[PDB]
Motif scaffolding. Structure first.
Motif, PDB file in Angstrom:
ATOM      1  N   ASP A 328       0.875  -1.150   0.000  1.00 32.54           N
ATOM      2  CA  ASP A 328       0.000   0.000   0.000  1.00 32.54           C
ATOM      3  C   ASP A 328       0.923   1.212   0.000  1.00 32.54           C
ATOM      4  N   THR A 329       0.652   2.185  -0.861  1.00 31.11           N
ATOM      5  CA  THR A 329       1.513   3.371  -0.948  1.00 31.11           C
ATOM      6  C   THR A 329       1.227   4.423   0.114  1.00 31.11           C
ATOM      7  N   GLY A 330       0.201   4.166   0.928  1.00 31.84           N
ATOM      8  CA  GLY A 330      -0.182   5.094   1.976  1.00 31.84           C
ATOM      9  C   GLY A 330      -1.611   5.584   1.804  1.00 31.84           C
ATOM     10  N   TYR A 336      -7.668  -1.490   1.899  1.00 28.92           N
ATOM     11  CA  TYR A 336      -9.126  -1.472   1.965  1.00 28.92           C
ATOM     12  C   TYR A 336      -9.779  -2.558   1.089  1.00 28.92           C
ATOM     13  N   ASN A 337      -9.327  -2.692  -0.158  1.00 26.69           N
ATOM     14  CA  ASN A 337      -9.890  -3.713  -1.046  1.00 26.69           C
ATOM     15  C   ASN A 337      -9.686  -5.119  -0.477  1.00 26.69           C
ATOM     16  N   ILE A 338      -8.476  -5.405  -0.005  1.00 27.73           N
ATOM     17  CA  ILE A 338      -8.184  -6.714   0.577  1.00 27.73           C
ATOM     18  C   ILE A 338      -9.227  -7.036   1.650  1.00 27.73           C
ATOM     19  N   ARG A 355      -1.982  -3.212   8.670  1.00 32.26           N
ATOM     20  CA  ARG A 355      -0.698  -2.959   8.053  1.00 32.26           C
ATOM     21  C   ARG A 355       0.402  -3.263   9.053  1.00 32.26           C
ATOM     22  N   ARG A 356       0.255  -2.744  10.266  1.00 32.64           N
ATOM     23  CA  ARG A 356       1.249  -2.941  11.315  1.00 32.64           C
ATOM     24  C   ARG A 356       1.381  -4.403  11.736  1.00 32.64           C
ATOM     25  N   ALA A 357       0.261  -5.116  11.708  1.00 36.93           N
ATOM     26  CA  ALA A 357       0.246  -6.523  12.068  1.00 36.93           C
ATOM     27  C   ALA A 357       1.067  -7.321  11.057  1.00 36.93           C
ATOM     28  N   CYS A 358       0.881  -7.029   9.776  1.00 41.97           N
ATOM     29  CA  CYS A 358       1.622  -7.730   8.737  1.00 41.97           C
ATOM     30  C   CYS A 358       3.124  -7.463   8.897  1.00 41.97           C
ATOM     31  N   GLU A 359       3.509  -6.195   9.041  1.00 39.37           N
ATOM     32  CA  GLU A 359       4.921  -5.846   9.189  1.00 39.37           C
ATOM     33  C   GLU A 359       5.564  -6.571  10.361  1.00 39.37           C
ATOM     34  N   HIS A 403       7.497 -10.463  -1.551  1.00 40.59           N
ATOM     35  CA  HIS A 403       7.156  -9.624  -0.419  1.00 40.59           C
ATOM     36  C   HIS A 403       8.000  -8.378  -0.552  1.00 40.59           C
ATOM     37  N   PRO A 404       7.356  -7.204  -0.519  1.00 38.16           N
ATOM     38  CA  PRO A 404       7.996  -5.892  -0.641  1.00 38.16           C
ATOM     39  C   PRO A 404       9.174  -5.576   0.256  1.00 38.16           C
TER      40      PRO A 404
END
Ligand SMILES: Cc1csc(Nc2ncccc2OCc2ccccc2)n1
Ligand SMILES: OC[C@H]1O[C@H](O)[C@H](O)[C@@H](O)[C@@H]1O
Length: 448
Positions: A328-330, A336-338, A355-359, A403-404
């Motif tokens: 997500d670029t921010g 949201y779509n996911i 987002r934080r959970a994934c990181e 993975h980014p």
């Protein structure tokens, strides 16, 4: 901070990683000695691929790849250059793995495989030919030789009955015969870690380690023959399949396991096994995220405390969402779509939490994995009269590639753990196919 308190639980300090690195090394040594190789959690399986091979055998080879979510068949051509031999896929085809092929017997499994091998032969008119066949089979295998080995036990969620304990190659043949349709001289059977390594060697002769970070996670390296007690000989080196995903199966990671790791394990196809792998592999990363999120909702800190019908089913949160989410670029549109597809209506902060959970999960995985690779590399270092040991690692796998951030976190963390080491990472372009063919091409100048 109330969320940062829960997520801080995934953090691992440099000291924790070193402990893990030191422990993996202790297990690698145990799996290598005759006296502990039996109850050793890190099997350290001799692969029979050796240091200095006699000579190749140019020509087209057929390569199989079973172990992913999509069984594959391909034709690769092996030639000869100054470097060494070259290789290249020329024809390929993928085949989805049916439900009836996964529940039945290995018999049916290899039968289905037998078909796909023939369907491939029709479409590319070549069924009338009989070429050497390289088998990249991604599971722990106890080799008796380059073309023989038994399946110790399925991993990653494969069930096929009556497969364990038996010869994989044999069963492959026991199915080619129940066809008559064609004939294949099944020359070599290799792990995907090994095939990847081999496929990079001809590009970089310094490549002596193969690593897979995909649905599963494992590594292989070149060991000094005298340390491979399980195999007669002290001259040269032999590639060894560490099968490090089983690391921690003896309780070596218990001080690091989280409630989520326990849940994921308790509900897996192989409870109590491949624990190290269940912290990194994409077969579990998403599920780790789903469990983290669910805890967040039950503590009324995400989605107002209401979890979707899908957010509550197992495997609903695919590892590819973790990747997308972290891309997500921010603007949160990706995140949201996911979540929308999952039946949620997240707020701005809901998206930032997910987002934080994934990181947190993918970062733990990147660091935990870095400890293993450092463990392997430092061990190799302890057998080399050089200031700076230069070594190349052939790598492959969706997580590591798509993975980014995994890749960078992982590299940085591995380098911190490996002083006096100049590690070079190469990604394998068709490492399995090309890897099996390149190995089969050497075993073929012996069986043909
Ligand atoms: C018994 C057997 C089958 S295939 C093989 N060796 C090799 N096969 C393909 C490429 C290279 C091989 O050995 C050279 C080498 C491999 C890895 C690291 C350094 C050198 N040995
Ligand atoms: O495919 C990556 C890895 O997944 C699992 O750890 C398998 O047991 C191992 O043999 C394979 O190399």
């Amino acid at each position: 901070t109330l969320v940062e308190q829960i997520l801080a639980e995934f953090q691992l300090q440099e000291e924790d990683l070193k402990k893990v690195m030191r422990r993996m090394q202790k297990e690698m040594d145990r799996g290598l000695r005759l006296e502990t190789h039996e109850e050793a959690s890190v099997k350290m399986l001799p692969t029979y691929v050796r240091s200095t091979p006699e000579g190749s055998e140019v020509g087209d080879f057929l390569s199989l790849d079973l172990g992913g979510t999509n069984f594959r068949v391909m034709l690769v051509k092996v030639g000869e250059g100054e470097e060494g031999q070259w290789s290249v896929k020329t024809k390929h085809q993928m085949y989805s793995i049916p439900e009836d092929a996964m529940t039945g017997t290995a018999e049916m499994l290899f039968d289905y495989i037998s078909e796909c091998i023939s369907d491939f032969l029709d479409k590319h008119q070549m069924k009338h030919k009989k070429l050497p066949l390289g088998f990249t089979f991604s599971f722990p295998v106890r080799h008796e030789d380059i073309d023989k080995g038994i399946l110790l036990n399925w991993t990653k969620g494969f069930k096929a009955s009556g497969a364990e304990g038996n010869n994989v190659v044999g069963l492959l043949r026991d199915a080619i015969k129940r066809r008559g349709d064609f004939e294949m001289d099944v020359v070599a059977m290799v792990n995907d870690t090994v095939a990847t390594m081999i496929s990079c060697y001809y590009e970089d002769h310094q490549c002596e380690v193969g690593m897979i970070v995909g649905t599963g996670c494992n590594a292989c390296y070149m060991e000094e023959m005298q340390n491979v007690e399980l195999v007669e000989g002290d001259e040269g080196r032999m590639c060894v399949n560490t099968e490090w995903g089983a690391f921690g199966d003896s309780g070596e990671l218990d001080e690091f396991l989280l409630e989520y790791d326990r849940l994921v394990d308790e509900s897996s196809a192989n409870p109590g096994q491949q624990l190290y792998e269940k912290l990194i592999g994409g077969k579990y990363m998403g599920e780790l995220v789903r469990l983290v999120l669910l805890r967040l909702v039950d503590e009324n800190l995400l989605f107002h405390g209401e979890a979707s019908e899908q957010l509550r089913t197992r495997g609903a949160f695919e590892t590819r969402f973790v990747s997308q989410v972290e891309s997500d670029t921010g603007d949160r549109k990706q995140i949201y779509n996911i979540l929308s597809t999952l039946g949620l209506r997240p707020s701005t902060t809901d998206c930032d939490i997910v987002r934080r959970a994934c990181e947190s999960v993918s970062t733990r995985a990147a660091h935990m994995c870095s400890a293993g690779l450092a463990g392997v590399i430092n061990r190799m270092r302890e057998s080399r009269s050089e200031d700076v040991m230069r070594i190349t690692v052939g790598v492959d796998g969706s997580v590591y590639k798509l993975h980014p951030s995994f890749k960078e976190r992982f590299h940085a963390s591995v380098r911190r753990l490996t002083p006096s080491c100049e590690i070079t990472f190469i990604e394998s372009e068709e490492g399995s196919g090309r890897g099996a063919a390149l190995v089969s091409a050497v075993a073929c100048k012996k069986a043909c």
